[PDB]
Amino acid sequence: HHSGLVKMSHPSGDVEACMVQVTCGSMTLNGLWLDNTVWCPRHVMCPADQLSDPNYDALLISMTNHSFSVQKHIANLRVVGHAMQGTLLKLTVDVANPSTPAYTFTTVKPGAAFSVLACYNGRPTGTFTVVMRPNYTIKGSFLCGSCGSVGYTKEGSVINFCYMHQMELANGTHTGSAFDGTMYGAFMDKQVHQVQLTDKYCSVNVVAWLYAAILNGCAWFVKPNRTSVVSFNEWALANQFTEFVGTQSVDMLAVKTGVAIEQLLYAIQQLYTGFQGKQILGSTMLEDEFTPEDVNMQIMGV
Amino acid sequence: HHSGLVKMSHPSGDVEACMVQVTCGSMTLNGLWLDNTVWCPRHVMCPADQLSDPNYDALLISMTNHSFSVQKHIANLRVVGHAMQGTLLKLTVDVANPSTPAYTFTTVKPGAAFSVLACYNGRPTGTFTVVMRPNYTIKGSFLCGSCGSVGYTKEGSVINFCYMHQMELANGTHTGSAFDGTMYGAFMDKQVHQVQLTDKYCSVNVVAWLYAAILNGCAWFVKPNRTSVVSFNEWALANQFTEFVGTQSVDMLAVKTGVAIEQLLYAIQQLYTGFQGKQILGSTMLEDEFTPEDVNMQIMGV
Numbered sequence: 001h002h003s004g005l006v007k008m009s010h011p012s013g014d015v016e017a018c019m020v021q022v023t024c025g026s027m028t029l030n031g032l033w034l035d036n037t038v039w040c041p042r043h044v045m046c047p048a049d050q051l052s053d054p055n056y057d058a059l060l061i062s063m064t065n066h067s068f069s070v071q072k073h074i075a076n077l078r079v080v081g082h083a084m085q086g087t088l089l090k091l092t093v094d095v096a097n098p099s100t101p102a103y104t105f106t107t108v109k110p111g112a113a114f115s116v117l118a119c120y121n122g123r124p125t126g127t128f129t130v131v132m133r134p135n136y137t138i139k140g141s142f143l144c145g146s147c148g149s150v151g152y153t154k155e156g157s158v159i160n161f162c163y164m165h166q167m168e169l170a171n172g173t174h175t176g177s178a179f180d181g182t183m184y185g186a187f188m189d190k191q192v193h194q195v196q197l198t199d200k201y202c203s204v205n206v207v208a209w210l211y212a213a214i215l216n217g218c219a220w221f222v223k224p225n226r227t228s229v230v231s232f233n234e235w236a237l238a239n240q241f242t243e244f245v246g247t248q249s250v251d252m253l254a255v256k257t258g259v260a261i262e263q264l265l266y267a268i269q270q271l272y273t274g275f276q277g278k279q280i281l282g283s284t285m286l287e288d289e290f291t292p293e294d295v296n297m298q299i300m301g302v
Numbered sequence: 303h304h305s306g307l308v309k310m311s312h313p314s315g316d317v318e319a320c321m322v323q324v325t326c327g328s329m330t331l332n333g334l335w336l337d338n339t340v341w342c343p344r345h346v347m348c349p350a351d352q353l354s355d356p357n358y359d360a361l362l363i364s365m366t367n368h369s370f371s372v373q374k375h376i377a378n379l380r381v382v383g384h385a386m387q388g389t390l391l392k393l394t395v396d397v398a399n400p401s402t403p404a405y406t407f408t409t410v411k412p413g414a415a416f417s418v419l420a421c422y423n424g425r426p427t428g429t430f431t432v433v434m435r436p437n438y439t440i441k442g443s444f445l446c447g448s449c450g451s452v453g454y455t456k457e458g459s460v461i462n463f464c465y466m467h468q469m470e471l472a473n474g475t476h477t478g479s480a481f482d483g484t485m486y487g488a489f490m491d492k493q494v495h496q497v498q499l500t501d502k503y504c505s506v507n508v509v510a511w512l513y514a515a516i517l518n519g520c521a522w523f524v525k526p527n528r529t530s531v532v533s534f535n536e537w538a539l540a541n542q543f544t545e546f547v548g549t550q551s552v553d554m555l556a557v558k559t560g561v562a563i564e565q566l567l568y569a570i571q572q573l574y575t576g577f578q579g580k581q582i583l584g585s586t587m588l589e590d591e592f593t594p595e596d597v598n599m600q601i602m603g604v
Contacts, residue, residue, distance in 0.1 A: 002474035006443040011426040013315030124313040127429060141308040141600045172304035284586055298443045
């Protein structure tokens with residue numbers, strides 16, 4: 001009856017120990033302290049009268065190490081170097097974080113889930129998980145002062161940082177930077193109207209959810225009928241779905257349930273025209289916020 | 303468009319530092335290490351051949367301090383005392399947890415939200431948030447080995463522990479103990495069929511969600527019509543809703559939006575008969591998994 005699915009985040013302690021406050025004049029936000037480096041959004045440099053068209057190159061040149069104040073309240077970290085990488089600053093500090101976890105930097109892909117640690121004034125305040133939408137936004141929960149909050153995944157003990165928060169778009173969704181300094185999607189870290197690409201249903205995550213339903217004894221939508229991946233993907237382009245790309249994680253769900261991917265691609269095509277008053281796992285609309293990995297881990301223990 | 307609402311958990315670091323593994327013979331699960339005490343479910347004492355009708359008094363008497371092995375892997379903690387409090391063991395250990403947070407023990411009430419740290423073999427693996435249902439279950443995500451995982455709320459820096467995981471009921475929901483040793487509801491920590499009370503919509507949380515909708519510019523369901531609290535509560539008893547009890551947190555939402563509680567109680571009565579193909583915050587059914595506090599904090603910054 002209950003699916004056994006929740007929105008599951010990584011434990012956040014490893015990352016909490018890396019959060020600091022960064023102040024530059026009238027601007028304050030959060031940074032990430034790893035080894036002798038503090039990462040933060042570059043718009044910490046920007047006076048509010050200039051957030052709509054900052055000249056970041058000129059702002060950077062105008063700064064000295066004194067221009068940045070970094071504090072940990074969970075130490076004052078003296079800045080001894082400063083540099084800009086895309087939309088992020090790299091501040092060099094005189095003390096290496098003694099609690100630096102094993103970490104990498106990676107870019108997250110549409111449909112994939114990651115954990116966010118929402119922070120204000122360098123203080124962690126909550127944690128949640130989101131999927132990167134096909135239009136490179138996330139449906140998060142961020143208020144003024146939240147920039148520099150980070151998103152990450154975890155492989156073993158290694159934290160893979162993938163997101164640093166920057167902006168809330170007009171429709172209430174959120175976007176930010178990867179740690180290579182790029183913004184996700186076509187977004188810019190300028191406080192002006194920006195075009196939003198269309199969101200889409202993440203087909204591989206809808207497939208995962210339908211498997212979750214079968215793993216819970218809910219399979220009324222499973223029929224012998226099948227749609228091929230190539231045929232579904234042509235259909236997807238006309239109906240606001242991502243093209244489906246199967247993975248080993250989806251294959252494990254097909255094996256466990258004995259229901260083939262192509263059967264669920266046909267189910268999705270029919271469900272999209274309407275559930276006809278039936279429910280799947282308590283919903284009367286397709287759910288794409290759980291991944292194949294979520295289902296394998298939370299339900300099957302993998 | 304996006305509500306700005308997510309399922310938000312507390313940062314989990316403070317609690318991660320308190321989790322240990324407890325082993326008693328063939329049974330292993332998680333414990334909570336605070337000061338010189340380790341709390342864990344008492345069914346760690348129970349051989350698997352006896353989980354359906356354990357004699358816990360006899361099991362306790364049969365134990366010595368050697369009968370419990372406690373490890374931290376995030377130390378071996380030597381047990382120097384053991385006692386039973388309701389459905390929990392209180393193990394006394396020779397070393398006080400140097401990372402004991404400020405804490406209290408409290409009982410959580412139906413409709414209220416708390417954060418859970420899911421742990422296996424004493425290792426934290428994920429965090430999520432749930433509301434205590436009116437039938438004293440939670441819709442969680444727990445597998446074999448998860449018992450002893452804890453739920454908590456946070457007031458300031460003080461962690462209020464309210465839940466220690468025990469059981470998965472036939473319908474996939476979960477229940478456990480408070481730290482006074484009671485099980486929530488009428489449940490017993492015995493592996494046998496147990497009656498489940500009916501779940502209900504948490505009216506105060508539906509009211510909160512409708513305010514969240516108004517705070518997002520979505521107010522098509524607001525009319526001048528009103529239903530009194532007394533009249534709604536009579537109706538609720540016939541329709542599987544909790545009786546509504548207003549709070550200061552709900553009042554702040556009424557003030558901010560200028561929409562009175564009684565207007566939303568009337569809205570709920572009508573929405574319950576059908577949304578007539580309209581959506582509220584992306585849903586075509588009433589949502590009761592967000593609290594008034596969630597809405598005040600996540601949307602209004604309170």
